Design a protein around this nucleic acid. Structure first.
Ligand SMILES: [Mg+2]
Ligand SMILES: [Mg+2]
Ligand SMILES: [Mg+2]
Ligand SMILES: [Mg+2]
Ligand SMILES: [Mg+2]
Ligand SMILES: [Mg+2]
Ligand SMILES: [Mg+2]
Ligand SMILES: [Mg+2]
Ligand SMILES: [Mg+2]
Ligand SMILES: [Mg+2]
Ligand SMILES: [Mg+2]
Ligand SMILES: [Mg+2]
Ligand SMILES: [Mg+2]
Ligand SMILES: [Mg+2]
Ligand SMILES: [Mg+2]
Ligand SMILES: [Mg+2]
Ligand SMILES: [Mg+2]
Ligand SMILES: [Mg+2]
Ligand SMILES: [Mg+2]
Ligand SMILES: [Mg+2]
Ligand SMILES: [Mg+2]
Ligand SMILES: [Mg+2]
Ligand SMILES: [Mg+2]
Ligand SMILES: [Mg+2]
Ligand SMILES: [Mg+2]
Ligand SMILES: [Mg+2]
Ligand SMILES: [Mg+2]
Ligand SMILES: [Mg+2]
Ligand SMILES: [Mg+2]
Ligand SMILES: [Mg+2]
Ligand SMILES: [Mg+2]
Ligand SMILES: [Mg+2]
Ligand SMILES: [Mg+2]
Ligand SMILES: [Mg+2]
Ligand SMILES: [Mg+2]
Lengths: 117, 110, 197, 65, 141
RNA sequence: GUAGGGGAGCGUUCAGUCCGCGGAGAAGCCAUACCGGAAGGAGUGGUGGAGCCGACUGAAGUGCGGAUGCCGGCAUGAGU
RNA sequence: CGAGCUGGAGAUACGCUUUGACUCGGGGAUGUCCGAAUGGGGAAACCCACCUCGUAAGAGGUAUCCGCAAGGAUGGGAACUCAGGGAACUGAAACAUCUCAGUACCUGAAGGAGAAGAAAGAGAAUUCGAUUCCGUUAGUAGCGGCGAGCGAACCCGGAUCAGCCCAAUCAAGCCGAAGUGGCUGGAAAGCUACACCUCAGAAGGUGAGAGUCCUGUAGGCGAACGAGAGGUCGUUGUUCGUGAAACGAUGACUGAAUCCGCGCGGACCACCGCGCAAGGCUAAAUACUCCCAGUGACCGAUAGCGCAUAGUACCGUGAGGGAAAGGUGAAAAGAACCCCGGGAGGGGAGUGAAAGAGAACCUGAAACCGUGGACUUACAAGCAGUCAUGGCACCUUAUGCGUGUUAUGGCGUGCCUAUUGAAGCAUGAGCCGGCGACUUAGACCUGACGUGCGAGCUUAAGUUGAAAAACGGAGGCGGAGC
């Protein structure tokens, strides 16, 4: 017996192509360039899962430093200050305190510069 | 791949016989065989009947003109009838005379 | 280990293919069986076989085209099949003892059914299917099963056949496939006391 | 096609009971007045191939002889 | 249809090619080379282009078929045959089927009970041990 | 983790058997945010108008992006 | 046979037919011109004659070779057969003997087969008994730049059997069982309720899927016609390559015995065995497949033949090469008539179950071209993605883990191949769709897994049976090595 392709190739193809909507020009309409674009997309996805974990830490840190310095303290000195007084806060959380709740962040500042004295 | 091929170019009924319409839209209506074509297996019965159109041609007559004429049917929607039963009926071949073959039912004969 | 029906009732004979029948060997026997009857009749053309002249189509280099030599090539629409099927055979010789053990184990399988029905003599008037139907009906053959019948009597077969749900086999036309194919087996029984010894 | 027997290997190789492969030591046809007499003696003889060379010989004569 | 073959009876074949699953690109064959190529040939006894081992080795002696003797053991005839005796057409029906060759009897392991044997030859220690147990050995005229 | 060796599987035709659907509408086609560890798989809806899914088993012309590959259709260069 | 017919062709008209048409079967009559062509010629299918009869019209004859005559031959035929002639690539990892291979090809002759055949044999048992074919012996014995590689036969088991004469029943065809009602549907075969035949449930057609509607099947009937010597030199054949070279086979030269004689048995001699050359025919088993029939884990429109038909169109001076091609509908009921337009095309209407089937007519993917709408873009450096967030929009696996779309930030050197090293200014590639590449074989070799038997295991050809399989021990493998 013989077994043509029948139906499989087009299903594969549409699969790729349908992953690829919103891609510019032929990248979203031609199979091969879709499939290709997608390989590179692979790289970018995996990488950036790790990397976004890298990025958000960064952000938190920025905000923290800011709040720190509003009340006359560097960030680094603020964080040894916190570790000294064994306050054990996430910097995600430290950021959110710093940004959202003024007086509270203030209190943590005073506690930390005390731990520094 | 002609229609008669399946039915050995053979008509199960003659021209002039009466026939009951077995299958379709004209179930059971009855009529005289006006035309029967063996090879094509097509048969005319004064009951089917359509409205055909004569289009342009100036013969017959310049204008168009519509028309009422019956449209032939496929052999397999036709049967010999039985004067007694009055219904759709099979056929047996038996003998008469004087060398004549004839057609009976479950109660001869047509 | 089992009874007849009409003209006696012996049948305690026949040792049987234990432990409780094995499907493995059955499989062996059956796939062999179907293999043995395949037509092996698939056939295609190769490059030697396509009607395409072998003349070079045009120049090896020059043209700017890709290089080709012929239009009878499997990368060519309308060419040869690269690796097609040519007519071959599938029929080997399965070891005898395994055919025997098989058949055996078929009967054995259908015994624990218990869908064996040993039979002596029959009773079907003179070669009539309606009478086969009544005979069958007296023996519990409702219609809701597919039945293989094996006998050497011309007319009982001649009575069964046209029944949709009966398949009819003379003498030792028996085989694991046909049997295992159906639900019930009509053995008959006359052949059984000889097919033990 | 039945695999043929490598006729060169007929007169120069031997199958063994276990299933190893033998041949005759070499250098005995004009390397004589060398000699030494113990070489000449040691060479006319016979011996087993090292090992890597076994498969091929086996494939040379399928019948063993 | 109920039935299934034995686990490990039938391995599905190698379909080389068919994607990066899988043996990608080169289907086992490696990169380039005469081994890579597609043609019937080398074949098997071709080393380098060199000068072959078999070609370097000394030929010894001619070839002769001669006669070969079909072996019958004592230990066979002995222990557990209970002497149905030897004759000519009896041995066959028991177990030493050959034809076309003459039969020989050889020492094997042990002798005890006496039997009458019909061979075409036998070893010294075999006739000696078959007589020393009371049995006679028959060579033809 | 490259050549390579090994292991478990996905999908395709045909075949046997079982289940079973289908004009109150099959295969094919189309959309989709659901499912599965992946090949993949279902739900619903639109199309279509007569055939076909699932399960186990068997056999293959069985899975494509490449080969200046082959046939075909349609783009670019250009309203030049 | 028994009512239709008047070819594919479907189209109008003429008409034929129960005094038996049409079709099927079987014989005859006619059968222009060319082609072995054959009266002569010739650029095939055309030109020109002569003779006998005939009233003319017309008819018949006029080639060569064997033969006295009668009669035979010439030409054609895919494969198959024998014969005369006879390659190379290639393999030997170079090449010359060798191998490819007595293959391809050329020529010849012939048949439905042909060849071969009735032992101056094979052979080693003082065994067998025409030939061919299958299994097997057996990759054994041998051959060989003893390299590559080439490779019997006897025995045994089968298929089919045969040995005689000369020179002193199938091809046309006919008969042929059994069902109705209601329901869905455009349409009944499907559903459903009861019902029947079966030596007949093989199959096809019937508005969807029919044992019981049609054609059929099982079974039966069935025809006037119809069919069934030796030698020497030079060489070569079989495993036979100058080898110690027997034997056959001829080109050249030469040339014996006829029965107490002759020829062989692998140089050669004796002995022991087998044989009666120089004279012919022979069916059967075997090969093939143009043609016919049945079947299919063969193909269904790039597949399968090159062709859903065509060796056509087309290309070539010629030899020769050589395509694509398929689908309204159940039924033509093939859209009268109205609207715009010269028309093409379309919109209505009407038919249809559906024109979401209208003749550029089954489905109708993708590339590719457009219309409309959502959110968007005129300070911008970009492998076009990816991540994060904000804006807008939307709500049928959807109010959240959202879907679409976007702004801005972070991050980011296409794929494949080939490589020490690829974004590379290295290779391939316009795009999408289809076609497209690790297979088959042997009864070979060697391992892994599994199964059946197990000191044993197994058959092959074939025989019979065959909607299956069984027999078949010839052979092969273990059994002891050196
Ligand atoms: Mg980290
Ligand atoms: Mg084609
Ligand atoms: Mg693998
Ligand atoms: Mg690739
Ligand atoms: Mg490569
Ligand atoms: Mg390399
Ligand atoms: Mg890994
Ligand atoms: Mg199936
Ligand atoms: Mg299908
Ligand atoms: Mg491509
Ligand atoms: Mg180019
Ligand atoms: Mg192109
Ligand atoms: Mg312009
Ligand atoms: Mg320009
Ligand atoms: Mg210009
Ligand atoms: Mg007629
Ligand atoms: Mg002429
Ligand atoms: Mg050459
Ligand atoms: Mg060479
Ligand atoms: Mg001829
Ligand atoms: Mg000579
Ligand atoms: Mg020669
Ligand atoms: Mg001679
Ligand atoms: Mg198509
Ligand atoms: Mg118009
Ligand atoms: Mg727009
Ligand atoms: Mg600026
Ligand atoms: Mg702007
Ligand atoms: Mg380089
Ligand atoms: Mg590398
Ligand atoms: Mg570039
Ligand atoms: Mg480049
Ligand atoms: Mg390069
Ligand atoms: Mg380029
Ligand atoms: Mg094993």
């Amino acid at each position: 017996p013989r077994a043509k392709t029948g139906i499989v190739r087009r299903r594969r193809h549409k699969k790729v192509l349908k992953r690829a909507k919103g891609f510019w020009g032929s990248r979203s309409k031609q199979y091969r360039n879709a499939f290709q674009t997608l390989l590179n997309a692979a790289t970018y996805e995996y990488r950036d899962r790790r990397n976004k974990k890298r990025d958000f830490r960064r952000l938190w840190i920025q905000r923290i430093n800011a709040g720190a310095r509003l009340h006359g303290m560097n960030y680094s000195t603020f964080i040894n200050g916190l570790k000294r007084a064994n306050i054990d806060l996430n910097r995600k959380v430290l950021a959110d305190i710093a940004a959202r709740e003024p007086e509270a962040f203030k209190a943590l500042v005073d506690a930390s510069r005390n731990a520094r004295q | 791949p002609s229609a008669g091929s399946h039915h050995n170019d053979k008509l199960h009924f003659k021209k002039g016989d009466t026939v009951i319409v077995l299958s379709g839209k004209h179930k059971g209506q009855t009529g005289k065989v006006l035309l029967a074509l063996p090879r094509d297996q097509k048969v005319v019965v004064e009951g089917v009947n359509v409205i055909t159109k004569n289009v342009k041609p100036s013969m017959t007559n310049p204008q168009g003109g519509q028309e009422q004429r019956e449209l032939a049917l496929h052999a397999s929607k036709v049967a010999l009838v039985d004067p007694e039963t009055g219904k759709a009926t099979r056929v047996r071949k038996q003998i008469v005379d004087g060398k004549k073959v004839r057609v009976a039912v479950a109660s001869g004969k047509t | 280990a089992q009874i007849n029906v009409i003209g006696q009732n012996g049948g305690r004979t026949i040792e049987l293919p234990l432990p409780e029948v094995n499907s493995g060997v059955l499989h062996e026997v059956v796939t062999w069986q179907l293999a043995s009857r395949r037509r092996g009749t698939a056939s295609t053309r190769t490059r030697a076989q396509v009607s395409k002249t072998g003349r070079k189509m045009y120049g090896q280099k020059g043209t700017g085209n890709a290089r080709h030599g012929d239009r009878s090539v499997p990368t060519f629409v309308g060419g040869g099949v690269a690796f097609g099927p040519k007519p071959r055979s599938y029929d080997y010789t399965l070891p005898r003892q395994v055919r025997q053990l098989g058949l055996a184990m078929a009967i054995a399988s259908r015994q624990e059914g218990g869908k064996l029905v040993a039979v002596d003599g029959f009773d079907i008037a003179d070669a009539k299917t309606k009478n086969f139907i009544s005979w069958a009906k007296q023996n519990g053959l409702d219609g809701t099963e597919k039945v293989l019948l094996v006998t050497d009597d011309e007319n009982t077969r001649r009575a069964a056949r046209n029944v949709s749900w009966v398949s009819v086999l003379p003498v030792a036309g028996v085989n694991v496939y046909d049997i295992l194919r159906h639900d019930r087996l009509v053995i008959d029984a006359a052949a059984l006391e000889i097919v033990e010894e | 096609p039945k695999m043929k027997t490598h006729k060169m290997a007929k007169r120069r190789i031997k199958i063994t009971g276990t299933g190893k492969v033998m041949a005759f030591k070499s250098g005995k046809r004009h390397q004589n007045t060398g000699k030494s007499g113990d070489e000449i003696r040691g060479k006319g003889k016979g011996f087993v191939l090292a090992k890597a060379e076994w498969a091929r010989m086996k494939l040379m004569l399928p019948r063993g002889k | 249809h109920d039935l299934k073959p034995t686990p490990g009876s039938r391995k599905d074949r190698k379909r080389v090619g068919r994607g990066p699953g899988g043996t990608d690109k080169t289907a086992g064959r490696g990169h380039k080379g005469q081994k890579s190529r597609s043609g019937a040939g080398k074949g098997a006894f071709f080393e380098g282009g060199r000068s072959r081992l078999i070609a370097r080795l000394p030929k010894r002696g001619f070839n002769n078929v001669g006669t070969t003797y079909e072996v019958v053991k004592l230990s066979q005839l002995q222990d557990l045959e209970d002497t149905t005796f030897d004759r000519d057409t009896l041995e066959a029906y028991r177990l030493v089927r050959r034809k076309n060759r003459p039969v020989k009897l050889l020492a094997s392991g042990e002798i005890s009970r006496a039997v009458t044997v019909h061979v075409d030859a036998a070893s010294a220690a075999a006739i000696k041990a078959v007589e020393a147990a009371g049995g006679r050995v028959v060579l033809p005229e």
